[PDB]
Amino acid sequence: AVQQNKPTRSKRGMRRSHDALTAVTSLSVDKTSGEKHLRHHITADGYYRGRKVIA
Amino acid sequence: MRHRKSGRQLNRNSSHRQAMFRNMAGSLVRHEIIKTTLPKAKELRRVVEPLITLAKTDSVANRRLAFARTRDNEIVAKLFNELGPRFASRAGGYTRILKCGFRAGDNAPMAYIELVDRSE
Amino acid sequence: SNIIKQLEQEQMKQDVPSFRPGDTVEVKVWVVEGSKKRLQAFEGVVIAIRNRGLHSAFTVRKISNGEGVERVFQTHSPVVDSISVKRRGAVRKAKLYYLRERTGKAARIKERL
Amino acid sequence: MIQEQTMLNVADNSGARRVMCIKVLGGSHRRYAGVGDIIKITIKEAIPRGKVKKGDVLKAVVVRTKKGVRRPDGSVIRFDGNACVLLNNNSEQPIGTRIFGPVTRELRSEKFMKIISLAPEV
Amino acid sequence: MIGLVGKKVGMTRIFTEDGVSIPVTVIEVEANRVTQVKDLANDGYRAIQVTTGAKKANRVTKPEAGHFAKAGVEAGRGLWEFRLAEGEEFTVGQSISVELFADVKKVDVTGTSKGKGFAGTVKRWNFRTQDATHGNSLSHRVPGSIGQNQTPGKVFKGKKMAGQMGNERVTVQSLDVVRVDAERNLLLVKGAVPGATGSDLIVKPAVKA
């Protein structure tokens, strides 16, 4: 329930081989306002798929 | 397991879950567009859309059915006198869901849900 | 699932009378002793109907020789020769499981008019 | 579904009122008895002048069961209580001379034909 | 002997006039179309690779849209293979019907069983539950001991622990063929076969027989 030996710099970074965040690299431009947005999300100004939805 | 089951529990007991959708169905009839989470929306679709199917036939026996599922007489009037005739020729799909991003306080995925006409 | 439906609806009988729970039916069943196919009767009260198309069943409960005997007949089965309603009971429930606890003038069912 | 410690009623006039199943016979680790199965019983309540007395250790065949039987049709015959016909240990024949209440025809085996030709129903 | 690939439609029953209800699993066995035969020379072994069903034109990818066009058959929802016994010889593009199973009387049905998820030792391995009461502290459906003391000093490879249950290929053998319907393309086999409704079943004849 507790370690017998302090793990190393090696094993601490080996565990964080999968802690690395994944960037999006998939921003989508809107066809009526040219805003980049998340795919299938509305824009910051409230356009979505060419239509003004939220305003 | 969970095979072929429906309904999100939403980390609520069944009474809180029933009272939360009674409120949230009331709010989608009031302002016709509300900003809720993405899993509380799509569960609101199973609540507010039978209310508009119910309001398509105006009768006393359905006005009290709508009142029993929406304990607010102002909602029952707008359902039957406004939203009923407005969705007369629509076969389902009275609401749409527009994902609007993430909540600041807890990173919850948010969405707008709104009636598909909104009459502007 | 029209495939199981067409496989089911070719085996259903066209001779199921419209009984309800509370009715007193008498169900003639075929029995083979060794080679004599005999037709014996089971006459009690319908206490439960399961409506499932081909998988429809109904439970008949009688008091035979001091004993409660329940019998869950599968209808649309070729062992049930005929079902015959002898009186119509007037109950407000679909499952009369409380008649296993009542026995006698307690278990009297008011006839349906 | 008669197992050990099951109190059964007595479907014959052999003297007993209540017996208790003290072994399900016919294979090791065997759990339940159906309506054709033989059980070792002890007599827990008898009538004062019968054939058997309270405390005898003998065999019985279960004839009525609240769990009930399963016909080839998928149909069930259940009963309101559990019953057995008390049998001799050595030559497993019925001790009694009458059979009270119905039986089912899961007993036609030509070891119980002096039960089918005694019982009122089936 | 070759199998056929089918789909679990569900379960129903047949009533013989004898009085028995035979529980069946309805298996839809559509026309399996041979896409590739195999030989001892080029491939090392003899088989046929069939396909069944119909896949839409925009989900079939180009490496398999060409593999189907080499045969001349349509697409399928998948490809499955069957080892050929040393007398039977098939042709590419031949459609095999459920008419194959006229004289078989007993089959083996393979399918992917229903996934139970991460099951526990009680559900997965029929471990016996410890006491619900009588003093027990937080240990009811836990497994108990997984080993010994110091002298093995390890758990043994193959220990029954909790893990993924179901979602696995399972073959049930020796199922009685009730009837073969050559016009609805149906095979009714007695009993239940692995898989849920809609899963792809692989029905070979019985090897044990």
Added chain:
RNA sequence: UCGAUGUCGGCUCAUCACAUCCUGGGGCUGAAGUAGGUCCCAAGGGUAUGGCUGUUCGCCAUUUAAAGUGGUACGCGAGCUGGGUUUAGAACGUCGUGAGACAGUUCGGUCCCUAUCUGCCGUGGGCGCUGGAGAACUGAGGGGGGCUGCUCCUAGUACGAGAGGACCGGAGUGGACGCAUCACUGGUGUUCGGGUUGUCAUGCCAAUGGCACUGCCCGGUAGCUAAAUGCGGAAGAGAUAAGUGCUGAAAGCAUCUAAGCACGAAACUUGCCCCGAGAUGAGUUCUCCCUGACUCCUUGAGAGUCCUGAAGGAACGUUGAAGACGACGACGUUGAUAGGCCGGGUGUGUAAGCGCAGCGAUGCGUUGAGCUAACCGGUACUAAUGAACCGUGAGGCUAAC
């Protein structure tokens, strides 16, 4: 080992040995048969529930084919228990003047740990496998399984004096165990319908809603599930064990062995199912995909620009009888992927409102009505957006032609 390695028993979960308890194969028998006695071979699977006691044990009651013996810290407390022993209270007998003591009893008496590493069970990511990709395989190796009663025929025959009662060979049915599955029979079903008590609320009546463990209840769809129903433990081979042989000398006789050739068990290897090419010894098959310019230099080893981004993949979204998360699967408008909707089914059980009867509770009619979840069939109504992103440009150094 005293700078701590928690004792007996129980439970859970085991694992090995063989000096074998059952089942399998034999030799002898003071083996007629049936039952045995004994030894030999064999560890594949199986190998009781209870009463009493803290008990292990034991003794009893019933089983069973049998209830094996041992190892594993007298397996197993970072898995459980805490009855026993062995803290502090108290008492009895007993011993001491006494404090107190007793392998003497007797009641009472705190069992901690969020797992780093190994191990194990599952499940992914990376890279490799040498152009990339999509598949289907092969199967080296692993693993699972591997139990058995009883009846019937053989046949009341072989045997025996009779009593009794077979081998071998089939046939059927169970038991325990496993795998799968919900069609049935049921369980559950706080997402369905209804009854009902108290009380608050919707102005009130009537209708409803909240709260009281889902208020308490009666039913119950799908799913999940056993007690429910299917199936399975092979047969066959191959080598053998103990064993029995045949031929056959050394030893003109024999002799199963030395040359040779036969038979021979649930063990062994297969056959059955499953995993599996990270099998780095990285396999095979089919299909798909890309056949542009230049510039820079130590230079046969490349690097840098412009061009073109393929097959495919990923991401995203709708999701799933898939699932902890990843993964896996379906789908993405050339669309039934989910929600809705429509029809149906199912389950409840005759809604409300109205009318009538009655003093009223309430009944009756409209009416098997109305509601109806996860079901089935459909239906683009809503949402699944054009993109973009990753991955490139024909792939290093004998035979045939």
Added chain:
RNA sequence: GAAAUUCCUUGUCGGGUAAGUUCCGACCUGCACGAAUGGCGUAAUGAUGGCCAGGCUGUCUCCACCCGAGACUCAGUGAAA
């Protein structure tokens, strides 16, 4: 009187149970009871010790399903031996 006391001891006999090292009734062979460190009874009383029975039940055979809180994923903060 084999007891809160009996080692041998699960004494022995009776009862209760299919079966009872516990219990109840005895017997007396009191290792090693005994008369105010009281002896024998004793109604009532007891969160007292032991035993039996009826009811009752997931205690169990043998567990299944469901409802919530965690576990699990995401975001924020952020220990411990």
Added chain:
RNA sequence: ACACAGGUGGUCAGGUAGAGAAUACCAAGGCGCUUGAGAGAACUCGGGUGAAGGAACUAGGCAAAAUGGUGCCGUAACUUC
């Protein structure tokens, strides 16, 4: 030691049920307990419900189930009445 599920004297004390300051639901009044969002694995807490059996569990009915109110009838051995 904490913005700590604990401790802390007295007073006031509405309605509807109810014997009641119990309890249930409410008023006046006060709050939603200073991390959320998902998901709906095992396992663990806290509950609900179970076919057939009913103590076979176990050291031991531990825990759970059950019983439960008012009125009336009726009630044993024993007893210090």
Added chain:
RNA sequence: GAGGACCGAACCGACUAAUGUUGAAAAAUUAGCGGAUGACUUGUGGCUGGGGGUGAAAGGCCAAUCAAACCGGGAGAUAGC
């Protein structure tokens, strides 16, 4: 109309079980449980002081400390470990 009477809240306790055991808490929570007109219970003052007190007696309690409290001193006791 008595009662160290009975049932049962406040209150005072603490029998059982589960949780908790780096807790919400250096003894608690949850469900049950005992007393509840009394040898009760509680507030506010007081008084008893360490070989001393107080004790319906457990070596109990005497400021989370008790077979001799705490603080300061002897004192850097001594320590064949």
